[PDB]
Design a protein around this ligand. Sequence first.
Ligand code: HEC
Ligand code: HEC
Ligand code: HEC
Ligand code: HEC
Ligand SMILES: [Ca+2]
Ligand SMILES: [Ca+2]
Ligand code: NA
Ligand code: NA
Ligand code: NA
Lengths: 376, 376, 357, 354, 125, 129
Amino acid sequence: QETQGQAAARAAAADLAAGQDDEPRILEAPAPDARRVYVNDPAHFAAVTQQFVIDGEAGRVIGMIDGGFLPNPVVADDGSFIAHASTVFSRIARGERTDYVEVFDPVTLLPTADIELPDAPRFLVGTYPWMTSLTPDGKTLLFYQFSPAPAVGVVDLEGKAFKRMLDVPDCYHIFPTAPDTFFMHCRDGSLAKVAFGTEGTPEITHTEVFHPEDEFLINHPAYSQKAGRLVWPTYTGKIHQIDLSSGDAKFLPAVEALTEAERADGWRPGGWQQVAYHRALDRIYLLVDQRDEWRHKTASRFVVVLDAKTGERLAKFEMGHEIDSINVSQDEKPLLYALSTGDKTLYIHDAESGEELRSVNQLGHGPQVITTADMG
Amino acid sequence: QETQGQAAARAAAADLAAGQDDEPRILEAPAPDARRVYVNDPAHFAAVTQQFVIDGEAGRVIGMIDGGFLPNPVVADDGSFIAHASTVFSRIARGERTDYVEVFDPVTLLPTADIELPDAPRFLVGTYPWMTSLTPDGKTLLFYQFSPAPAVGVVDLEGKAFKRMLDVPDCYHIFPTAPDTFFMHCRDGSLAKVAFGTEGTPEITHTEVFHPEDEFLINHPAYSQKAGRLVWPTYTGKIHQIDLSSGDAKFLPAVEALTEAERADGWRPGGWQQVAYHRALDRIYLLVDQRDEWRHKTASRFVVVLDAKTGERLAKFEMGHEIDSINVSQDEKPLLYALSTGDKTLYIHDAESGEELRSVNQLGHGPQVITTADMG
Amino acid sequence: ADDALAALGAQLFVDPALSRNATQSCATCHDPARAFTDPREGKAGLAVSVGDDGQSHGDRNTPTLGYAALVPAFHRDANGKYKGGQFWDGRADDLKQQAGQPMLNPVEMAMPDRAAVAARLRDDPAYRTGFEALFGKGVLDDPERAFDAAAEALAAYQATGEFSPFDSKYDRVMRGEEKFTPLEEFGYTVFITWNCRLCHMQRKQGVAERETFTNFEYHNIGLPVNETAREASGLGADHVDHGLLARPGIEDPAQSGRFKVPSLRNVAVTGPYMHNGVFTDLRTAILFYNKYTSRRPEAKINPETGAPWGEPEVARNLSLAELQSGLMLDDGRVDALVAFLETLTDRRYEPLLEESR
Amino acid sequence: ADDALAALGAQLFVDPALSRNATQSCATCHDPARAFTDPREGKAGLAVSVGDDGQSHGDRNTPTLGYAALVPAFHRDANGKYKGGQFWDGRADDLKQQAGQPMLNPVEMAMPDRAAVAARLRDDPAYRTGFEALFGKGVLDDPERAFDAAAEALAAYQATGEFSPFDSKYDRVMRGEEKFTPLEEFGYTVFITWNCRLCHMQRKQGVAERETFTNFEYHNIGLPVNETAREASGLGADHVDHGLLARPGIEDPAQSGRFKVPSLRNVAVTGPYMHNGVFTDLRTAILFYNKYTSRRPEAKINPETGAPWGEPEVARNLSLAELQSGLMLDDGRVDALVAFLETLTDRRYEPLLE
Amino acid sequence: TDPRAKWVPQDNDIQACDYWRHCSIDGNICDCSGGSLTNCPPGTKLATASWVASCYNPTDGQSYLIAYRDCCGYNVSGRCPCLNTEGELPVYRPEFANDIIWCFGAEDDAMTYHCTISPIVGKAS
Amino acid sequence: TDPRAKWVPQDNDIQACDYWRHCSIDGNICDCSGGSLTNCPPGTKLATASWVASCYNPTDGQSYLIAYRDCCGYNVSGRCPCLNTEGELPVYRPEFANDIIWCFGAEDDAMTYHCTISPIVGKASHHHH
Ligand code: HEC
Ligand code: HEC
Ligand code: HEC
Ligand code: HEC
Ligand SMILES: [Ca+2]
Ligand SMILES: [Ca+2]
Ligand code: NA
Ligand code: NA
Ligand code: NA
């Protein structure tokens, strides 16, 4: 009811009346928790970008982190640090390129490491969360490189040094599953498992081809590292699920996010981060709307919620705003975060009821990526 | 009535129908001319900023130049180069600061000089054109330094080198009159004349104090280096004109831009670049509106035009938009540029009649500064 | 008329009476069974061809005549780029200016002079009748007229539909008569989005009416010397093939080592490749491009020899801006490009593709 | 009670019988006519004071007693900054604990012991009466009680409105009774927007009820030795005055060379300045702060000597964060500040301004 | 304007996001920051890389291959932003994928995105 | 909503541009990017420089000196931007001037503008305002 700015004015007035002293200083952010959410603003390819650290419970910006060109943010699931791989140039968008990884303390937001990446090796692309990824123990950051060929960069966060590039096949995205292993999705319709050492040709294994050549898997699959669940929608809201928790890929049964009559009536997923997965609830959330088949990056106004095991629909929420990305807190009674690139607003919904609870606006220019830590 | 995009669609279709080939390549901007106008977007203090190069005749963006934090643009009046003093940091907004001057070729927009300024000596302030200035011969750039004390930096554009800092007294802004001389405006209400040889203290002379302690002279006076006319409004629309065309300051009759009556009904100048001066017309343009005495930075919806010689009002335009900055082309039948920070749009008016002819929208985030070359 | 002139060229084209020892016609080196290239083994394999004396080898690989009639005559366009002409170095302006050269080249057909050519033409009553009907009585008695008339007949013959039928699978696909295999279609997609497009397509933009997969420009792509061909041709260990700079009247050192971009039509059947026949296999010619892009050690190794490609014969004026694309072709994209380029084979040479596969 | 106690303190304060040769009272060094500081010219000018023996000089400048009753008792606050106390090095906890020290200091009043103090108290029938009525019969026969009672009386006398009248121009202006002159108001504006207010204001934010222009913290501002004063003190040319670190209980090396932020009240009339009286002029004191900000050759030079300021007596723990403000005070701001500081002069010392 | 409606090409205004050649553009139309439909703005560098789409030209009934190319080395122009995705395939079919900054090949190693041009390279298969 | 009307201080919401202490603020309210009314957000550096305004507090009718201070070393927050100019004088009266980036004194020489705080430092009034 009372806004945060209102509660602050009240307290400031009380301190003045009471003669209360206080030292102006640099605040710490509150301890990272399950309802912290980070919104990255790729800013529609601006050379500099911003990340907003948000208390989702209060709907309050608690901090910000600056970044360079299309950085890839990662958040350690255990809340110990956050980091990004970023790119700057010596004269704004021109001149000598430096790619680097910074690691930040999640309370002071001070960079505790700044690790140069040799030979400007980052893949510059509209931000895909799974193109730069932390290994589960948090000691390694992996980043994708496209040019000259698909490759993956290995960065030692603990020793604060770049390690090596690994050559991989014609494959994309990086879902780490262990300190030395990740999966990628390959042009031929398989996943590739890549197991790497400090030196030597990485061991690369392919799964069976798991989708036909004309079934399109979106750029923003949800991957729960702690569950090893890769939830990969196709353009039609068909959802591939791959279980990587054994260390090898087990293909789960496909589910449809939309019914036959919905599909016949033009319903399709669309947006940017189209799918979220709540690990504890084993639940998929998909951004859908009625749309032509090639409007697959436009906002959507509905979220369907479906049991990941059975594909049973549990809800269809009318979000009431143009939503491009969703994600969920990973605690019980999760929040469903619904980020509107066009409104630059994070809408914070009760994931159970779909009700909008609060919102955080003025999140940059073109905010697209929501990240939460799964701390539980 | 055909728009630029429409005309372009037809040319393309015609080339396609006629089977006419063309090599995709980097265009050159049209040669600089009187109707080129530059719009600088300090972007409400963002760490990187943009300058838009605009063909005022067609209302068309013909190029852009990237800048760092609150850079100071200058445009050689002869159209031979543009330059800015800019500021970058090794990590977006943090880390080692580099101040530098870049000079650019006005057609390829390529930088032809990048000149480091030692000891990060630039004054960081919302953009005031006369905080950085070209000497009439275009060979020297002078920039203001506030910290630790008012000082002026001498940069050799010809040798492409920084030279030295000049100690000045408690004074502000820089109005070059000569290869070795400029005026500054002082706290004690005088102007100072700073003549610098190649070495030692400059020779500093003060004029008579020309305004009382409680008359406030705006941060954005117009200065026509070619006329040597310094046009300096105060908060009430009183206008100091100082003739610097002889090497020394001759104070012109002071004039009121607003009638004694108007000032009684709340009329005051307001905006950013509140004043423009057309050298060949000896004419002052002032952004005015009805406002409280302390809303002096708000947009104004009206422009008044007056004779620099007599002070007689010549016109009063209802701009039809919220205008923050004005300037004028220095050719015959000038355009009156009316830049709206709020709309991010340069409205291009006929200076004679005040009709809005065309406009160029999407000029960054908070564009505030209009520059034109005075090429006649 | 256009018919009779081409029919006369058809006879000249296959007539070995136009070589000193009467062993060699145009058709000998430009064999119509082989997309007008030379199937014969010489001291450097198929890299370079052997002349009528049976010993002399050229220093350049014999190119197809297919589609050579679509090349513009040699000129310098407004951007200062040379275009068109005939021979790998553009030193002939057009087909007509090229046609009498092999006749008089002691390395090729080796007739001593125009008069020896005319005397051969007189010996044959069909030529007297055929030349006379098109060029007038006594044409064969004037060595200059006879020689020029033979070149004109030969250039007319090369302009006929038979040399440029446009009946490749690619042509059929572009008419909607059929579709590319999925591999071919990928090959086409890569060809037109990667750097090949910057040189092996007629136009910078828009659609060509009779595409022949060359922009007719001159580029030094930084090829090494073909040692065995260079030994066979006898030009010397210290010889440099300067490409376009060898054309009389080109003086600009920036043209040294640039050769005419070949039409990729029938490329699948006209191996070995490049101006000196240096690469045997189509795949090798495509892989050469990865030397500019790939960071892998193997990108620098010619797979036909296991050794480095070699220092460029001309180390200057390389087309680095186009070549250093920042993107390496993986083997699937190389396969796709082979399959696409095979679609550029004329209908009548489709049977020859079986062996190359 | 508080009235009679103060009135007893008032008698002791001027009584030279509390010195060994009966030549010196508190008032000799803290002369009421000079905002409770020492007018007496000595070997080192007015930089240090001379004790009862007519020979011993101190090694520190005698500070005003005005407003010293506003300073909190010595303590370490929750951010780890020490605050309050008395003496330049806060070695006394409060006024009561400070009062007995001059009496027994051989370089000052030089009484040998508390008994000798008590005996002098016993000689004066008026003291028997005054002390006994406040502390009980026989108080002067017990030297411990006698001396504590004397210190308590002196501290109560220092806590009277007479020592802290808040009747400066600044006080009158803050009460809306008067206006600052343009120069004074400019000086006040500079003082509260420049680094001075990071140390010479009671509070970080909000408005103080009884502002004394000090946050009661300890800072090393990097001052040099006062050579003549240090000569006169006889402590020797080796000697290093460690300021706060000399307080018993303070072990923390970060505290070496730090001294209590003086109240700027009456500053215009209590020259020379700083803990060792090194600067005779108020203007010099202000100029000293430019050594940290200004790039100008003159900022390096003490304008009283024409020579460089001197290396800090203690070249560690400088308050660089505050002192390196990035801004230099031009002559205008220095003038403005002098005008402003002069407004902190108590009404009764307004005539001393010349 | 209904963002989710089937895209409807027009061949009458190249600055508008429904212009027929922009059927798979992502970013900003170069025509709006001083380039043109098929040329880069001054100061920027023309990439040699491209991604493609088959775009229907309502003027002639024909579908053309538009092999987009980025103009690089400047911050994003901020003028005429557009994102269309006709035929757009995910990043693993990169020749049809448009979130990628297709600045490879640009002079001076320029890799920042400023805007995109829309030249034709073929009639569609 | 009328940008030219006399500014009307309120004492009920610090994130709004008409909050009484923001009477000469220029930039962004630190309270909207993880600071508070009088503290900087994490990661930024608090400048020791300030400019002052005397701001009228509607609540007690007293006028207070607000010594604005910048939080520096981050790109501008972009949240709760405000520009007010009560008593604001031009740059040659820098003590009252608010286009200046008042980042001097900030740790690490941070000079980029992120947001401004609005702490009270005195009562008192100005001749000019
Ligand atoms: C083998 C000894 C040959 C005989 C007999 C003929 N040609 Fe030839 N041709 C040959 C080579 C080695 C080359 C390239 C030489 C070089 O300097 O580049 C050629 C080239 C042509 C061309 C130009 C084709 C192109 O550049 O794309 C034409 C049009 C041509 N040849 C035609 C031609 C005719 C008409 C002949 C009989 C008169 C003839 N050739 C004989 C090898 C040999
Ligand atoms: C201009 C910079 C080019 C680019 C990019 C590509 N090619 Fe090319 N190609 C070019 C020239 C100048 C030549 C002749 C080089 C010489 O000196 O001989 C070629 C040749 C080929 C060939 C051999 C054809 C023949 O011998 O008849 C093939 C198969 C070929 N080129 C293919 C090719 C592909 C698939 C490309 C994209 C990877 C490609 N080229 C780029 C000029 C240029
Ligand atoms: C000169 C011989 C003095 C006589 C007699 C007295 N005092 Fe003093 N006082 C003197 C000096 C040199 C100093 C500073 C010494 C140091 O080490 O810092 C002082 C200090 C005080 C203080 C502390 C003031 C402050 O820190 O702000 C108090 C409260 C004080 N003096 C009181 C005092 C009394 C009550 C005296 C009579 C018993 C007395 N002083 C004598 C110099 C001399
Ligand atoms: C904390 C880092 C401070 C800042 C910033 C300023 N001052 Fe200060 N001042 C400080 C201390 C600790 C002391 C005593 C220093 C010592 O060791 O002796 C002082 C002293 C003064 C004085 C002398 C007062 C007296 O001797 O009674 C004056 C006149 C003074 N200070 C003024 C002043 C001004 C005007 C400042 C802003 C330019 C200023 N100081 C900054 C602590 C600090
Ligand atoms: Ca060949
Ligand atoms: Ca003193
Ligand atoms: Na060979
Ligand atoms: Na030549
Ligand atoms: Na101690």
